[PDB]
Write a protein that binds this ligand. Structure first.
Ligand SMILES: O=C(O)CCCC[C@@H]1SC[C@@H]2NC(=O)N[C@@H]21
Length: 106
């Protein structure tokens, strides 16, 4: 994983990877995905990269939710799957799942 580097996914969301020291990813994510909240709010991202793949987590404090992405990097493409864990308006933990493909911008 190149660091620093900057990636955007097909939904328009932005992932800035600032460092990957000792394999620990440190960066910032901002959602721009239609159908989701916390649009435009940069949140810290944290995870791990190894020779075999990567994952990262972003906590969306204002939305009472967090998402974990898991995937790999093939050059300038980073295909992933994610799970969004949220505490709903009645306090019930729930989840949603989907995919994302991030493409390197710089
Ligand atoms: O709606 C929320 O609870 C917070 C924002 C969640 C955005 C998710 S993270 C997985 C998917 N990929 C995106 O680029 N945005 C959504």
């Amino acid at each position: 994983l190149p660091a620093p580097s900057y990636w955007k996914n097909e939904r328009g969301s932005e992932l800035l990877i600032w460092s990957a020291n000792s394999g620990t990813i440190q960066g910032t994510f901002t959602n721009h995905a239609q159908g989701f909240a916390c649009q435009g709010i940069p949140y810290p991202a944290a995870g791990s990269v190894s020779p075999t793949g990567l994952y990262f987590v972003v906590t969306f404090a204002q939305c009472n939710s967090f998402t974990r992405w898991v995937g790999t990097i093939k050059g300038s493409q980073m295909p992933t799957s994610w799970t969004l864990f949220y505490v709903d308006n009645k306090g019930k933990p729930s989840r949603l799942k989907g995919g994302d493909i991030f493409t390197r911008v710089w």
